[PDB]
Amino acid sequence: SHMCDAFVGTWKLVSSENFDDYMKEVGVGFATRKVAGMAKPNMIISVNGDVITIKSESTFKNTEISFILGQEFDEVTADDRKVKSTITLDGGVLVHVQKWDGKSTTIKRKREDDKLVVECVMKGVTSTRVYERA
Numbered sequence: 001s002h003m004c005d006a007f008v009g010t011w012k013l014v015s016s017e018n019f020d021d022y023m024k025e026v027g028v029g030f031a032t033r034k035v036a037g038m039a040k041p042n043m044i045i046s047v048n049g050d051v052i053t054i055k056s057e058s059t060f061k062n063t064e065i066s067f068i069l070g071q072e073f074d075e076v077t078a079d080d081r082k083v084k085s086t087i088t089l090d091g092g093v094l095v096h097v098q099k100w101d102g103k104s105t106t107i108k109r110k111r112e113d114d115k116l117v118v119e120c121v122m123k124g125v126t127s128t129r130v131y132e133r134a
């Protein structure tokens with residue numbers, strides 16, 4: 001047993017709040033916001049040694065990142081941003097920072113009851129995305 005045991009699994013989106021505004025703040029254009037906002041992704045989290053993999057799969061896009069905590073990596077996001085990302089564990093929360101074009105967004109993933117809660121923040125705009133086990 002280890003670092004991320006309670007995150008591992010297959011998770012499905014069950015609720016979203018303020019996601020459109022988050023995507024506007026990030027710079028996502030109209031058509032992508034509409035199609036991406038309709039998606040109902042599954043998030044699949046696995047661990048092998050020190051390497052964590054997070055997949056997002058939906059009718060919009062399928063994405064996958066693999067990383068070591070605290071070790072920066074280049075990421076192409078589902079909306080096609082080229083970002084430099086770093087993911088750390090801070091008090092049991094996975095904290096994922098993306099930097100690009102002098103901008104920054106922070107995405108927190110936490111276990112709360114039987115849910116995996118994803119909080120997406122950019123400047124003053126937050127979106128909360130709630131996932132349950134598949």
Ligand SMILES: Cc1oc(C2(C)CCCCC2)nc1CC(=O)O
Pocket residue numbers: 023026028036041056077078079107118120129
């Ligand atoms: C943190 C994050 O980012 C996204 C993006 C990249 C999807 C495509 C449109 C722009 C945002 N969704 C989420 C939320 C989630 O995975 O549920």
